[PDB]
Write an enzyme that holds these catalytic residues in place. Structure first.
Site, PDB file in Angstrom:
ATOM      1  N   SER A  61     112.636 -25.910  23.573  1.00  6.66           N
ATOM      2  CA  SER A  61     111.445 -26.313  24.314  1.00  6.66           C
ATOM      3  C   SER A  61     111.489 -27.660  25.044  1.00  6.66           C
ATOM      4  CB  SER A  61     110.219 -26.267  23.405  1.00  6.66           C
ATOM      5  OG  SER A  61     109.885 -24.921  23.126  1.00  6.66           O
ATOM      6  N   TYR A 147      99.804 -23.655  22.570  1.00 10.70           N
ATOM      7  CA  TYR A 147     101.187 -23.803  23.004  1.00 10.70           C
ATOM      8  C   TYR A 147     101.779 -22.419  23.231  1.00 10.70           C
ATOM      9  CZ  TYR A 147     106.013 -25.602  22.980  1.00 10.70           C
ATOM     10  OH  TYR A 147     107.305 -25.963  23.262  1.00 10.70           O
ATOM     11  N   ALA A 315     113.294 -26.298  20.009  1.00 10.42           N
ATOM     12  CA  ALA A 315     114.106 -25.539  19.083  1.00 10.42           C
ATOM     13  C   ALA A 315     114.462 -24.161  19.586  1.00 10.42           C
ATOM     14  CB  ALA A 315     113.381 -25.419  17.741  1.00 10.42           C
ATOM     15  N   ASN A 340     118.033 -25.816  13.421  1.00 10.05           N
ATOM     16  CA  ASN A 340     116.608 -26.008  13.657  1.00 10.05           C
ATOM     17  C   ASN A 340     115.965 -26.451  12.343  1.00 10.05           C
ATOM     18  OD1 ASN A 340     113.868 -25.805  14.226  1.00 10.05           O
ATOM     19  ND2 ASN A 340     113.867 -23.562  14.392  1.00 10.05           N
TER      20      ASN A 340
END
Length: 358
Positions: A61, A147, A315, A340
């Site tokens: 992202s 989001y 991630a 991650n």
């Protein structure tokens, strides 16, 4: 590098790597404008390839920051306006729910509840049109923030329509090249695969899979050197010669909406500095970052505030990245890892380092 930077970085990152069991990691600290690099572990465990300043990591992202700036550049070029309805650039979106949804809403996750992910079954361009046409908003536009990759992803695709260039084409020519980010890619070329680290999920080596609007939402791969340069550019946009690009960067850091102590820009997210670590550390935890939150419109948007903690977490299945900077202090940091791990741990480490340097 100055012993103070060396010490704080190592004393902070070494423990992080051990606690989170990170295979490989690269860190860049921008201090008073200059970059300092640090690397640990492996880019590829099986082939024993170490992480170097040339290792490419999936940004996940954090790619949205590039999309936001590319969009800002398009605005500066006069090709698009954030106040323009989405349908102006996609006439096929005739569904009534889109009336009132602007490019601003798409870019800032405030369209009314667009999903976090575009369904895997969406491959073709007609599959994508269908997806957006059939989507039913849970809220009116500009009222809540959720989001979503399907939101900023569509923004990116539409923002480059006027230019007639493909998204990757526009990104390379309008952002990467002008900023000399010569080792940053949407699609890693065969020549650079020797430097492409593997991501690790549950011990398995993995690379991000192709997906609809992946380039726009989470498809950039880059080196710690290019990312440090990306931070430098965002710290001091005025030193950028390309006029529209200079403006674009400033527009991506403007404050469009406020939720709690956070402000939403284009890709970038900001908080007033000095910040409260737990205000950003806990805020980073997907729990808060991905939740549905009412937003307050900033009318009109506040131009980039130098006294801000500007950041973005990122991630993919096998990578975890973080970028944060404070314009007022000409200070910044980039953390790229091929695992991650928890966002709170990233922000905590970043804070610990930057606070120490100013």
């Amino acid at each position: 590098a100055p012993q103070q930077i060396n010490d704080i970085v190592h004393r902070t990152i070494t423990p992080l790597i051990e606690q989170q069991k990170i295979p490989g990691m690269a860190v860049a600290v921008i201090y008073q404008g200059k970059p300092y690099y640090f690397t640990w572990g492996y880019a590829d465990i099986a082939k024993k390839q170490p992480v170097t300043q040339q290792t490419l990591f999936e940004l996940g992202s954090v790619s949205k920051t590039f999309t936001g700036v590319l969009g800002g550049d398009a605005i500066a070029r006069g090709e698009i306006k954030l106040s323009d309805p989405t349908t102006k650039y996609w006439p096929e979106l005739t569904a009534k729910q889109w009336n009132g949804i602007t490019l601003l809403h798409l870019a800032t996750y405030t369209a009314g509840g667009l999903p976090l992910q575009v369904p895997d079954e969406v491959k073709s361009s007609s599959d994508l049109l269908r997806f957006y046409q059939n989507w039913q908003p849970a809220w009116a536009p500009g009222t809540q923030r959720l989001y979503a990759n399907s939101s900023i992803g569509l923004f990116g695709a539409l923002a480059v329509k006027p230019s007639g260039l493909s998204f990757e084409q526009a990104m390379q020519t309008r952002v990467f090249q002008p900023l000399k980010l010569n080792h940053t890619w949407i699609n890693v070329p065969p020549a650079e695969e020797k430097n492409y680290a593997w991501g690790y999920r549950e011990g398995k080596a993995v690379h991000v899979s192709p997906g609809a609007l992946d380039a726009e939402a989470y498809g950039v791969k880059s080196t710690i050197e290019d990312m440090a340069r990306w931070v430098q550019s965002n710290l001091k946009p005025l030193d950028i010669n390309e006029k529209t690009l200079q403006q674009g960067i400033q527009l991506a850091q403007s404050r469009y909406w406020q939720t709690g102590d956070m402000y939403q820009g284009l890709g970038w997210e900001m908080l007033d500095w000095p910040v409260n670590p737990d205000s950003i550390i806990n805020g980073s935890d997907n729990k808060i970052a991905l939740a549905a939150r009412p937003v307050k419109a900033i009318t009109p948007p506040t131009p980039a505030v130098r006294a801000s903690w500007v950041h973005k977490t990122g991630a993919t299945g096998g990578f975890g990245s973080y970028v944060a900077f404070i314009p007022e202090k000409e200070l910044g940091i980039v953390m790229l890892a091929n695992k991650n791990y928890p966002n709170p741990a990233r922000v905590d480490a970043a804070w610990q380092i930057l606070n120490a340097l100013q």
